[PDB]
Scaffold this motif. Structure first.
Motif, mmCIF file in Angstrom:
data_model
loop_
_atom_site.group_PDB
_atom_site.id
_atom_site.type_symbol
_atom_site.label_atom_id
_atom_site.label_comp_id
_atom_site.label_asym_id
_atom_site.label_seq_id
_atom_site.Cartn_x
_atom_site.Cartn_y
_atom_site.Cartn_z
ATOM 1 N N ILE A 52 0.803 -1.227 0.000
ATOM 2 C CA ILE A 52 0.000 0.000 0.000
ATOM 3 C C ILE A 52 0.838 1.282 0.000
ATOM 4 O O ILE A 52 0.511 2.173 -0.791
ATOM 5 C CB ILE A 52 -1.034 -0.026 1.150
ATOM 6 C CG1 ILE A 52 -2.044 -1.141 0.930
ATOM 7 C CG2 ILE A 52 -1.718 1.313 1.361
ATOM 8 C CD1 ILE A 52 -2.799 -0.993 -0.322
ATOM 9 N N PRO A 53 1.898 1.460 0.800
ATOM 10 C CA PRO A 53 2.686 2.690 0.670
ATOM 11 C C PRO A 53 3.408 2.845 -0.664
ATOM 12 O O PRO A 53 3.536 3.986 -1.108
ATOM 13 C CB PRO A 53 3.665 2.608 1.844
ATOM 14 C CG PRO A 53 3.014 1.785 2.788
ATOM 15 C CD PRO A 53 2.321 0.763 2.034
ATOM 16 N N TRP A 56 0.813 4.437 -2.902
ATOM 17 C CA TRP A 56 0.600 5.827 -2.543
ATOM 18 C C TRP A 56 1.754 6.720 -2.996
ATOM 19 O O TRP A 56 1.521 7.835 -3.458
ATOM 20 C CB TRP A 56 0.370 5.941 -1.040
ATOM 21 C CG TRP A 56 0.242 7.331 -0.635
ATOM 22 C CD1 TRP A 56 -0.780 8.172 -0.886
ATOM 23 C CD2 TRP A 56 1.241 8.090 -0.001
ATOM 24 N NE1 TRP A 56 -0.495 9.414 -0.406
ATOM 25 C CE2 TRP A 56 0.753 9.386 0.141
ATOM 26 C CE3 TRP A 56 2.511 7.790 0.475
ATOM 27 C CZ2 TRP A 56 1.478 10.370 0.745
ATOM 28 C CZ3 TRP A 56 3.222 8.757 1.057
ATOM 29 C CH2 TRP A 56 2.721 10.031 1.185
ATOM 30 N N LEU A 59 1.228 7.263 -6.811
ATOM 31 C CA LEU A 59 0.219 8.275 -7.108
ATOM 32 C C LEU A 59 0.699 9.664 -6.751
ATOM 33 O O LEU A 59 0.335 10.639 -7.405
ATOM 34 C CB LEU A 59 -1.060 7.992 -6.342
ATOM 35 C CG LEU A 59 -1.944 6.834 -6.718
ATOM 36 C CD1 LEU A 59 -3.022 6.767 -5.682
ATOM 37 C CD2 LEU A 59 -2.523 7.104 -8.073
ATOM 38 N N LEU A 60 1.492 9.774 -5.696
ATOM 39 C CA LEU A 60 2.034 11.054 -5.285
ATOM 40 C C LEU A 60 3.040 11.581 -6.294
ATOM 41 O O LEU A 60 3.218 12.792 -6.410
ATOM 42 C CB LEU A 60 2.666 10.900 -3.912
ATOM 43 C CG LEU A 60 3.112 12.123 -3.153
ATOM 44 C CD1 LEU A 60 1.907 12.942 -2.877
ATOM 45 C CD2 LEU A 60 3.760 11.691 -1.886
ATOM 46 N N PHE A 62 2.541 11.186 -9.536
ATOM 47 C CA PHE A 62 1.665 11.764 -10.550
ATOM 48 C C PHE A 62 1.037 13.075 -10.109
ATOM 49 O O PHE A 62 0.803 13.948 -10.940
ATOM 50 C CB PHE A 62 0.558 10.787 -10.906
ATOM 51 C CG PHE A 62 1.000 9.651 -11.745
ATOM 52 C CD1 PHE A 62 2.090 9.762 -12.562
ATOM 53 C CD2 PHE A 62 0.343 8.450 -11.690
ATOM 54 C CE1 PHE A 62 2.499 8.709 -13.340
ATOM 55 C CE2 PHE A 62 0.756 7.393 -12.465
ATOM 56 C CZ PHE A 62 1.841 7.531 -13.288
ATOM 57 N N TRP F 180 -3.578 4.901 6.231
ATOM 58 C CA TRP F 180 -3.170 4.631 4.862
ATOM 59 C C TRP F 180 -4.329 4.701 3.891
ATOM 60 O O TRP F 180 -4.134 5.128 2.756
ATOM 61 C CB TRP F 180 -2.469 3.278 4.743
ATOM 62 C CG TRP F 180 -1.083 3.323 5.241
ATOM 63 C CD1 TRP F 180 -0.605 2.767 6.371
ATOM 64 C CD2 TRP F 180 0.002 4.039 4.657
ATOM 65 N NE1 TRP F 180 0.712 3.059 6.523
ATOM 66 C CE2 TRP F 180 1.112 3.844 5.480
ATOM 67 C CE3 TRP F 180 0.145 4.811 3.506
ATOM 68 C CZ2 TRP F 180 2.338 4.391 5.201
ATOM 69 C CZ3 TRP F 180 1.353 5.351 3.234
ATOM 70 C CH2 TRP F 180 2.441 5.137 4.074
ATOM 71 N N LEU F 184 -4.553 7.482 0.864
ATOM 72 C CA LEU F 184 -4.738 6.974 -0.476
ATOM 73 C C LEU F 184 -5.967 7.578 -1.131
ATOM 74 O O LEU F 184 -5.938 7.874 -2.326
ATOM 75 C CB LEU F 184 -4.814 5.457 -0.392
ATOM 76 C CG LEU F 184 -4.526 4.540 -1.547
ATOM 77 C CD1 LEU F 184 -3.130 4.799 -1.989
ATOM 78 C CD2 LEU F 184 -4.634 3.149 -1.023
#
Lengths: 254, 254, 254, 254, 254, 254, 254, 254
Positions: A52-53, A56, A59-60, A62, F180, F184
């Motif tokens: 999961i990180p 994230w 996406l960060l 982008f 998280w 997200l």
């Protein structure tokens, strides 16, 4: 390993990717790993902190890239209206994607070298006769030994320190082996991309570079043009204000 | 030993090789050595930490070098189409390879001077009667004394501190001897290369130096040429935008 | 003693020799002395750490000096072809050799003032009745008292702290006496060389100084000449690229 | 007391003498005093650390001074050939000698204020009935009480802490008294030299000052003259190299 | 209290007096007070540390002042030959003396506020019935209670901590009272000197100021005049050297 | 994670939003979390620290933004009098609102990753048989076990450390999972806003940018116009003052 | 609270008063409070540390102010000879006095907020039945309970820690109340002086400001005029010196 | 939270208000809270530290503001003589008052978030049966349980640590709730003032801004006009001084 590019902001070839890789590993240090030490939740906690990180941080990359809105503008517009070739748009998207994968790769590598995600996720998969007394998990149910093995990642919930230290060293060794194989595969992928692809995608690289320089020029030149069109009208308003108020500032400041 | 070139970024003759040697030894300090302390896995862990991170630091020198794509471009092109002599391409590859071996050599040297890779890999090869009681490994099986000797690299899994301290000092001595012989052979190799080879490969050195300067000039001049061709077309678009919007900014800001 | 020339990079007369003497003593601090504490290996470990790292620091002075390839070029060429007098080549070699002996001398001096190399190498040569109980080495074999005396450099392998402290102070005193006699002989050698030799080797000193300035000028002037011959041909290639691509950038960016 | 001239490199009147006095006292702090605590060797160790490092700091002032070779050149040349008066040579030697005595004086003063050299050298000269029990040195031989008193400088070899603390305070008091009398005599000597001698040796001072300025001018002007005679011949060689290689760089870079 | 003028080297009106007052108090911190704790030597140690270091700091102000040789030159010369009025010489001596008393006054004040010199010198003058048990100094001789009271400044030689703490607080209170009365008398003396004396000694102040500016101008102008007379003759020697050696550098560097 | 933009104040695109996100997380570190450990107040304390400080950081973004008064001026004025389109006012409000949500989002994320707000709010919702002895909450009332479970967030009010550590790890795991998922969802919202909205709200963006530049120009130009109208009248008053007072300064300063 | 004006030397309106207030509070931190803990001396020690250091900081403000000699010059001269009005002299004295009261006020405030001066001075005035056992001061004389209460400021001389902590908190509360009332009265006095007095003493303020600027101009212009009159005569002496010595430097340096 | 505006002295819009808010919170950290732990004095101490230091920080904002004397000058002058409108004077007073409330608001907020003022003031208002044993305050008088509850803010005067920790957490929770409601009301007041009032008080804002710029111009221009009128008369006095003294400096310096 932070002072190197901190004291040398010249060794970069892009700045935001070096900052986000630094921020990814510093966020790993600041994160307090809290394994549940329960056999229902250890796997999803340990593997979720490995999955999961990185999503994230991807996406960060982008969100922080200021060319994804201009690229989304071009893709939304119909064919024929598009001022760009489809290879230039594909090359541009591939450029943003490759720089957005640095901070996910830094997270996965510090997580595997630290060993805590594998210790949390895989401690109920242990065979505890390799580590200490054999008389630990006799007299227990299958349910109760799953609760016993789930508490290995927790020092203050697992009492046999010798079995805990031996099982922690075994799993951290396997995690460091996966971390070195991950680093080696991602660097060899980086080698093949930086050797074979500039032999294949050329002059899309040169059109995408002109596109990136054109954006930074158009943003800056729009800023200073707004400022000079402001200074025309602001000089008009300020001078017209003091036409009347200096008529009052005669008696008020003399 | 970091403040020296940190406060003196002038003693270099290449910058990325001094940074990566600094990063190689700092990554050794940050790495938490976790010997499995099991007789099946100690050798591959201890020798793998001496072999695998140098391979990765070597590939990372090829990935970070910005001339490996231009060299891969020239080698992919057919003979006759190649604008370069084969000796200039061989000299160029040899230049990149020699600078990419600094960070592997720094890793191998800090690993042998620290002594933990030999302690993990070679503790089951010990003859434990040289170190303490002889009554330790009597009453054990051959299998059980291999498990006993495998726990020597682990302080909290080996109980006899006198035998552990004596065996650790013996192996760290041999590891430091191999580290000094490694440093001495690699520096004497560096002496013969920097004395005999510039007597033999000359004017390939001068063609490769002109090739390297030509690349840095061509990249920079392409960047500023894209920026001046941007400023032409960006000035056109910004001025044409305010032709209509200042027609609205009449009533909107006066 | 590092902040002095660190904050004053003006008190030098050569820079690389001050850095390598600083690096030699900092590497002594970072090195973890691990005496084997075995009577077969203590002498070669203790005397090897006094001999082998000075040889390596000496070779490293030749590798880092950028005039050893030019000197090796001149010596390889036949007599008659040589553009230099043999006294200028001998003076040049003597100049490189004398600056390459600073970091070996710094290593030998910190090693003798610290006292650990003599403590490791000479503890089996002790006469232990001068230091504590006489009843220690009675009841032992000649072999067993050699193992007993070999463990004196190791605090956690030698149990009688009073005999260990007395024997350590005695040997560290003798090591510091040898360190002060070494410093005094090498400084008096430095005095006779810097007083008698410039009365004897003059105008070879002036030819070697012109030779050293000629090398730094020839390297720099070759670098900027390659850059200006690059800028001619790079301007040709970039302008010819935008002859065709700005024909496409008509419709693509207007 | 290091930050004062460290942050103020303007309060000097010579720079190398302030650095060497700083280095003399920092080397005293870094030196680990290791008294033998044996009655044969305590005197020569304690008095040798008061005598031998000042001799070495004095010679080091002659080695680091760059006018001792020019002065040795003038003294070696015969009378009549000498371009200098004998009073200018004597004044020059006296100038170098007086600045070379600062770091020896700093060493002697920190050594006497610390008190360890007197504690090592003079502890067998004590009269131990002034310090504790009288029943200590009864029942001992004259030889055995010399061994008893020799261990006073060593905390971990002397067991009666009250007698050790009282004897250490007594000797450190006498050492600090000698340190203040040494400072007071050397400063009053410095006062008489800086008041009476410039009333007596004048215009030798002015000739020696012109001699010192002439040396720094002649060294610098020889350096830049070698560089401009290099740039003439290096421009010839570089331009003649590219006469032929740009004939190859036609097909090789176009 | 060091960072104030350290970060503000503008609040001065003379620089060497602010540095020496800073150095006087830092030398008090670095000095390890070692009271003999013997009734014969406590007074001279405690009062000697209040008297002797101020005398030395006073002489050090005369040695570091560069006008004391010029003043000693003028006083040695006979009357009639003297180019100065006797009031200008007296004013000059008074100026040097007043700035040389700052570091002695700083020493006396830190010594009295710390209280250790009075504790050492006056602990045999105590009346110990004011501080604890009365049964301490009964059963002792007059000689033995002088030895008992002399050990009060030493924590590890005096066993009754309550009597030691009470006697130390009493004497440190009296020492701080003398330190505040000393500060108050010396500041009120400084007030009367800086208010009454510039009403009385004027135009000797203006002649002494012109004398001080004339010295700094004459020293600097002599330095640059020696350098320009060096550059004339050094240019002659260097050019004449290369007349012959460039005749050799024809074949040697072409 | 503060040194990154602290040493790089160039990676911003707005400055006050990066400072307030830094200040939001530093205020979380400085806040001393004090759970009441009472079953009536734990929920409102724990959920109030997750709700109320984000509302305050949101309002603080409106107070610190210097365009909210100019926007409130435009909205208060009637339709027809308004010089702006309603889409430009809506775009302006949306711009201020989106930058004012960064510091609330930073607070919610550090609060959920720390886990203390969920530990305080949800510890009475636990099922304590999953964590330790089952014999804890037998023999208690429903009221008394609510008081027992409410003291879990307090180490010094809860005595069974094993049950407390297990319940704390379980709730901090769920809190980190919500943290998280919050990160997200808010980053994917940021992605859709920075990709879809600049495809939809364009030229309101360009009018709002001209509006923002016009405000900064009008404020600055009003400041320097007030200063030049001050300098006219201040020169009049000062010169007229010295017309009379220099008539007194004749006799008063000559 | 030192870094504020340390990193901002712009928020001042006078510099020496901000430095002396900083030095006053730093001297309070460095002062080691040593209450006598005797009932005869506690009052004068505790109240003397509240009275005597403010008197000394006040006089030190007069000594460090460089206008008190010029003001003392004007007051000493007879009426008629005085070039100044008596209101300008009174305003000048009031200006120096008001800036000299900042460091006394800082001392009194840190002393009352710390509470030790009231604890020393007023602990024999306590009524000890409010603080602990009532059975403490029964069985004592009036003399003996005064000695008992006098030891309350001393932790290592007062044995009942509960009574000592309660009495210390009570007196430090009253001292902090007096410190806040002192701060509030002195700031309200500062408010009335900075509001009412510039409505009453104007143009004496303007004459005193011209007087202060005239002094700084006259001191600086006298310094550079002495330097240019030095450079005339120093050029004469240096050139005349080299008329004869360059006649010797012919043979001596050619 | 100090390094933010410390390293960024650009994010301000007034400087003295940011410094005083920083100084207000740093003074809270330096203040040693000393609750009396007596039931007569706890309320006035705890509530006085919440009331009295904000009044003092408010007055200190008026004392440090350099426009309060000019405003007091205008209000003292009669109507008709006043050069300002009464709305400009009211706006000016409101501007000074609003910036003087920042440091009081910072004090109240750090005091309520810390919780010690409520713990001191409200611990006798507790109902102690909610916190521990019920058998504490039985057997006590109403007077004696008020003394018992008053000692809760004091760790070393209250013996039951469980009741003290529970009562401290309860009151610090309520204090933090009041601190968040205080922050939220004062920020919402700041929002309504910075949104509604610039819609209502405009052109008094512009007259008060011209008034503030006129003061800073008039103060600076008076300073440089005094300096140029000094330089006229100081040049006269210095030149006339050297007319006579250079007549003496003939024989005195030639």
């Amino acid at each position: 390993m932070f002072q190197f590019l901190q004291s040398n902001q010249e060794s970069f070839m892009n700045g935001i990717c070096g900052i986000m890789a630094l921020a990814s590993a510093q966020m790993y240090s600041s994160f307090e790993f809290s394994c549940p030490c329960m056999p229902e939740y250890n796997y999803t906690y340990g593997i979720g902190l490995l999955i999961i990180p990185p999503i994230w941080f991807f996406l960060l990359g982008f969100v922080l890239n200021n060319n994804v809105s201009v690229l989304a503008e071009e893709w939304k517009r119909p064919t024929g209206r598009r001022t760009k070739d489809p290879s230039v748009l594909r090359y541009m998207l591939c450029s943003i994607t490759q720089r957005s994968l640095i901070a996910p790769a830094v997270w996965v590598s510090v997580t595997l070298m630290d060993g805590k995600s594998f210790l949390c996720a895989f401690s109920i998969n242990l065979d505890i006769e390799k580590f200490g007394n054999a008389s630990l998990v006799i007299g227990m149910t299958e349910t109760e030994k799953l609760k016993f093995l789930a508490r290995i990642p927790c020092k203050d919930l697992f009492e046999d320190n010798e079995v805990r230290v031996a099982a922690t060293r075994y799993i951290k060794c396997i995690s460091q082996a996966c971390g070195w194989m991950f680093l080696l595969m991602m660097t060899f992928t980086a080698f093949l991309i930086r050797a074979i692809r500039p032999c294949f995608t050329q002059a899309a690289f040169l059109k995408t570079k002109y596109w990136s320089h054109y954006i930074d020029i158009e943003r800056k030149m729009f800023d200073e043009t707004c400022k000079e069109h402001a200074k025309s009208f602001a000089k008009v308003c300020i001078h017209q204000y003091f036409e009347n108020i200096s008529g009052e500032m005669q008696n008020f400041h003399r």
